[PDB]
Design a protein around this motif. Structure first.
Motif, PDB file in Angstrom:
ATOM      1  N   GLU A   1      91.771  91.910  57.788  1.00  0.00           N
ATOM      2  CA  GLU A   1      91.762  90.968  56.634  1.00  0.00           C
ATOM      3  C   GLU A   1      93.186  90.671  56.169  1.00  0.00           C
ATOM      4  N   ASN A   2      93.383  89.486  55.604  1.00  0.00           N
ATOM      5  CA  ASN A   2      94.692  89.074  55.114  1.00  0.00           C
ATOM      6  C   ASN A   2      94.860  89.643  53.704  1.00  0.00           C
ATOM      7  OD1 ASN A   2      96.386  85.822  54.741  1.00  0.00           O
ATOM      8  ND2 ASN A   2      96.987  87.920  54.194  1.00  0.00           N
ATOM      9  N   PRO A   3      95.719  90.660  53.549  1.00  0.00           N
ATOM     10  CA  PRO A   3      95.930  91.262  52.230  1.00  0.00           C
ATOM     11  C   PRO A   3      96.416  90.286  51.165  1.00  0.00           C
ATOM     12  CG  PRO A   3      97.741  91.792  53.642  1.00  0.00           C
ATOM     13  CD  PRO A   3      96.667  91.213  54.533  1.00  0.00           C
ATOM     14  N   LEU A   4      97.159  89.263  51.578  1.00  0.00           N
ATOM     15  CA  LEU A   4      97.679  88.294  50.627  1.00  0.00           C
ATOM     16  C   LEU A   4      96.594  87.429  49.988  1.00  0.00           C
ATOM     17  CD1 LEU A   4     100.918  87.061  52.443  1.00  0.00           C
ATOM     18  CD2 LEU A   4     100.607  89.065  50.972  1.00  0.00           C
ATOM     19  N   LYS A   5      95.433  87.313  50.631  1.00  0.00           N
ATOM     20  CA  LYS A   5      94.364  86.508  50.052  1.00  0.00           C
ATOM     21  C   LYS A   5      93.805  87.163  48.783  1.00  0.00           C
ATOM     22  CE  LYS A   5      92.399  83.410  53.587  1.00  0.00           C
ATOM     23  NZ  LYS A   5      91.141  83.006  54.302  1.00  0.00           N
ATOM     24  N   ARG A   6      94.116  88.441  48.570  1.00  0.00           N
ATOM     25  CA  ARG A   6      93.652  89.134  47.368  1.00  0.00           C
ATOM     26  C   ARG A   6      94.253  88.453  46.137  1.00  0.00           C
ATOM     27  NH1 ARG A   6      89.248  91.509  47.405  1.00  0.00           N
ATOM     28  NH2 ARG A   6      89.917  92.663  45.537  1.00  0.00           N
ATOM     29  N   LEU A   7      95.381  87.783  46.330  1.00  0.00           N
ATOM     30  CA  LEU A   7      96.040  87.075  45.238  1.00  0.00           C
ATOM     31  C   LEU A   7      95.096  86.072  44.588  1.00  0.00           C
ATOM     32  CD1 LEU A   7      98.743  88.346  45.645  1.00  0.00           C
ATOM     33  CD2 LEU A   7      99.516  86.228  46.758  1.00  0.00           C
ATOM     34  N   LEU A   8      94.192  85.521  45.388  1.00  0.00           N
ATOM     35  CA  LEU A   8      93.292  84.485  44.908  1.00  0.00           C
ATOM     36  C   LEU A   8      91.927  84.878  44.362  1.00  0.00           C
ATOM     37  CD1 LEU A   8      94.258  82.038  47.735  1.00  0.00           C
ATOM     38  CD2 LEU A   8      94.715  81.682  45.303  1.00  0.00           C
ATOM     39  N   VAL A   9      91.395  86.022  44.775  1.00  0.00           N
ATOM     40  CA  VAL A   9      90.070  86.414  44.301  1.00  0.00           C
ATOM     41  C   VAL A   9      90.035  86.515  42.775  1.00  0.00           C
ATOM     42  CG1 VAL A   9      89.621  87.599  46.464  1.00  0.00           C
ATOM     43  CG2 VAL A   9      90.511  88.860  44.529  1.00  0.00           C
ATOM     44  N   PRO A  10      88.993  85.942  42.149  1.00  0.00           N
ATOM     45  CA  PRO A  10      88.828  85.949  40.692  1.00  0.00           C
ATOM     46  C   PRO A  10      89.028  87.288  39.986  1.00  0.00           C
ATOM     47  CG  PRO A  10      86.724  85.705  41.782  1.00  0.00           C
ATOM     48  CD  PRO A  10      87.788  85.406  42.805  1.00  0.00           C
ATOM     49  N   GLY A  11      88.506  88.360  40.571  1.00  0.00           N
ATOM     50  CA  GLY A  11      88.640  89.670  39.957  1.00  0.00           C
ATOM     51  C   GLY A  11      90.026  90.300  39.972  1.00  0.00           C
ATOM     52  N   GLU A  12      90.987  89.668  40.642  1.00  0.00           N
ATOM     53  CA  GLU A  12      92.339  90.222  40.704  1.00  0.00           C
ATOM     54  C   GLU A  12      93.209  89.734  39.558  1.00  0.00           C
ATOM     55  OE1 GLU A  12      93.779  92.496  42.216  1.00  0.00           O
ATOM     56  OE2 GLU A  12      92.751  92.890  44.118  1.00  0.00           O
ATOM     57  N   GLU A  13      93.581  90.645  38.668  1.00  0.00           N
ATOM     58  CA  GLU A  13      94.423  90.277  37.536  1.00  0.00           C
ATOM     59  C   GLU A  13      95.888  90.200  37.936  1.00  0.00           C
ATOM     60  OE1 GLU A  13      91.546  92.814  34.494  1.00  0.00           O
ATOM     61  OE2 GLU A  13      93.698  92.688  34.093  1.00  0.00           O
ATOM     62  N   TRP A  14      96.518  89.075  37.623  1.00  0.00           N
ATOM     63  CA  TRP A  14      97.931  88.892  37.916  1.00  0.00           C
ATOM     64  C   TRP A  14      98.740  89.457  36.763  1.00  0.00           C
ATOM     65  CZ3 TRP A  14      99.910  83.645  40.214  1.00  0.00           C
ATOM     66  CH2 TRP A  14      99.280  83.415  41.447  1.00  0.00           C
ATOM     67  N   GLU A  15      99.827  90.138  37.091  1.00  0.00           N
ATOM     68  CA  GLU A  15     100.709  90.687  36.073  1.00  0.00           C
ATOM     69  C   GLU A  15     101.714  89.584  35.731  1.00  0.00           C
ATOM     70  OE1 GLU A  15     104.194  93.294  37.160  1.00  0.00           O
ATOM     71  OE2 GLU A  15     102.952  94.759  36.071  1.00  0.00           O
ATOM     72  N   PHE A  16     101.940  89.354  34.441  1.00  0.00           N
ATOM     73  CA  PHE A  16     102.894  88.346  33.993  1.00  0.00           C
ATOM     74  C   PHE A  16     103.984  89.005  33.160  1.00  0.00           C
ATOM     75  CE2 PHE A  16     100.549  84.583  35.217  1.00  0.00           C
ATOM     76  CZ  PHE A  16      99.215  84.951  35.136  1.00  0.00           C
ATOM     77  N   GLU A  17     105.237  88.696  33.475  1.00  0.00           N
ATOM     78  CA  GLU A  17     106.364  89.228  32.722  1.00  0.00           C
ATOM     79  C   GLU A  17     106.774  88.141  31.737  1.00  0.00           C
ATOM     80  OE1 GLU A  17     110.660  89.014  33.833  1.00  0.00           O
ATOM     81  OE2 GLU A  17     110.274  91.098  34.442  1.00  0.00           O
ATOM     82  N   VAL A  18     106.680  88.452  30.448  1.00  0.00           N
ATOM     83  CA  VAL A  18     107.014  87.500  29.395  1.00  0.00           C
ATOM     84  C   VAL A  18     108.321  87.875  28.707  1.00  0.00           C
ATOM     85  CG1 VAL A  18     106.209  86.395  27.275  1.00  0.00           C
ATOM     86  CG2 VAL A  18     104.553  87.198  28.989  1.00  0.00           C
ATOM     87  N   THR A  19     109.277  86.951  28.700  1.00  0.00           N
ATOM     88  CA  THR A  19     110.572  87.188  28.062  1.00  0.00           C
ATOM     89  C   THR A  19     110.878  86.046  27.095  1.00  0.00           C
ATOM     90  OG1 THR A  19     111.315  88.163  30.152  1.00  0.00           O
ATOM     91  CG2 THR A  19     112.986  87.786  28.452  1.00  0.00           C
ATOM     92  N   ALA A  20     111.123  86.382  25.832  1.00  0.00           N
ATOM     93  CA  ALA A  20     111.412  85.371  24.816  1.00  0.00           C
ATOM     94  C   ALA A  20     112.889  85.352  24.433  1.00  0.00           C
ATOM     95  CB  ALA A  20     110.560  85.625  23.580  1.00  0.00           C
ATOM     96  N   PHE A  21     113.404  84.153  24.169  1.00  0.00           N
ATOM     97  CA  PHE A  21     114.802  83.955  23.795  1.00  0.00           C
ATOM     98  C   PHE A  21     114.934  83.072  22.557  1.00  0.00           C
ATOM     99  CE2 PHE A  21     116.495  85.465  27.890  1.00  0.00           C
ATOM    100  CZ  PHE A  21     115.385  85.306  28.714  1.00  0.00           C
ATOM    101  N   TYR A  22     115.761  83.491  21.602  1.00  0.00           N
ATOM    102  CA  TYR A  22     116.009  82.685  20.408  1.00  0.00           C
ATOM    103  C   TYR A  22     117.461  82.225  20.550  1.00  0.00           C
ATOM    104  CZ  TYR A  22     111.755  84.713  18.304  1.00  0.00           C
ATOM    105  OH  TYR A  22     110.463  85.109  18.038  1.00  0.00           O
ATOM    106  N   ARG A  23     117.638  80.921  20.734  1.00  0.00           N
ATOM    107  CA  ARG A  23     118.941  80.303  20.964  1.00  0.00           C
ATOM    108  C   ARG A  23     119.657  80.985  22.131  1.00  0.00           C
ATOM    109  NH1 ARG A  23     124.592  79.918  17.596  1.00  0.00           N
ATOM    110  NH2 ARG A  23     123.468  79.067  15.787  1.00  0.00           N
ATOM    111  N   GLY A  24     118.935  81.166  23.231  1.00  0.00           N
ATOM    112  CA  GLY A  24     119.516  81.777  24.409  1.00  0.00           C
ATOM    113  C   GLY A  24     119.594  83.290  24.436  1.00  0.00           C
ATOM    114  N   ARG A  25     119.323  83.938  23.307  1.00  0.00           N
ATOM    115  CA  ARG A  25     119.379  85.395  23.239  1.00  0.00           C
ATOM    116  C   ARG A  25     118.020  86.045  23.466  1.00  0.00           C
ATOM    117  NH1 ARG A  25     122.134  89.544  21.634  1.00  0.00           N
ATOM    118  NH2 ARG A  25     121.261  91.287  20.421  1.00  0.00           N
TER     119      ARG A  25
END
Length: 232
Positions: A1-25
């Motif tokens: 099986e293609n391990p990369l296809k796991r990226l697409l299955v509905p049950g797979e939660e993607w991790e998101f890195e959130v970074t906020a900046f105020y006036r570039g900081r």
């Protein structure tokens, strides 16, 4: 099986890195995984609270503008995945604009890629073209594909032209994509096995040679939709 296809299955939660900046900081950073995505702020989606500017800013003018934005956020900027697409919807009152760019905070340039809609979901990222471009990159006939989503959050009154000064900027990086690019970069110059962490729920880092990775990428393309010219 293609391990990369796991990226697409509905049950797979993607991790998101959130970074906020105020006036570039940089004033905030958090990495989140949630089935219903996130909400930059009773509603679905993991709430990510942007901090009060009093904790990092000194300019009364910028602090005031930021507090205004924190005030219009309301339900917030929702971002989630559904299939091969990342969707965004502005649930609150802040005019929010987006753009896919490099990891660095983007200049005004020609403006944002668009404004996040409020009445309905809006597509902001398609994994299809990204993978195709990634393959082109591994072939050495193209530049590394971009995966960083930048959200510029302005006030509710549409005359502050927020994309000009970009005082409130939030970068959202699906870490799986950052990892796929790094794997292509590192693997492209290595004859050995290299490890790639997909950063999706219940997964383990994959050990692959460049040939294996390229083959899996080629097959991954078959697991996504690509609109044909003039196709209905």
């Amino acid at each position: 099986e293609n391990p990369l296809k796991r990226l697409l299955v509905p049950g797979e939660e993607w991790e998101f890195e959130v970074t906020a900046f105020y006036r570039g900081r940089q004033v905030f950073q958090q990495t989140i995984s949630c089935p219903e995505g996130l909400r930059l702020v009773t509603l679905p989606g993991w709430p990510v609270t942007l901090p009060d500017p009093g904790m990092s800013l000194t300019d009364r003018g910028v602090m005031s503008y930021v507090r205004h934005v924190l005030s219009c956020l309301g339900g917030g900027l929702a971002l989630w995945r559904a299939g091969q697409w990342l969707w965004a919807q502005r649930l609150g009152h802040c005019h929010t604009y987006w753009a896919v760019s490099e990891e660095l905070l983007p200049n005004s340039g020609h403006g944002p890629d668009g404004e996040v809609p409020k009445d309905k979901e809006g597509g902001v990222f398609d994994l299809g073209p990204f993978i195709v471009d990634l393959i082109t990159f591994t072939e050495g006939s193209g530049r590394s594909p971009r995966y960083a989503l930048w959200f510029c959050v302005g006030e509710s009154w549409p005359q502050d032209q927020p994309w000009t000064k970009r005082l409130v900027m939030v970068k959202v990086v699906p870490t799986c994509l950052r990892a796929l690019v790094e794997m292509a970069r590192v693997g492209g110059a290595s004859s050995l096995e290299n490890t790639v962490d997909l950063h999706i729920s219940n997964s383990h880092p994959l050990s692959l040679t460049s040939d294996q990775y390229k083959a899996y990428l080629q097959d991954l393309v078959e697991g996504m939709d690509f609109q044909g010219p003039g196709e209905s």
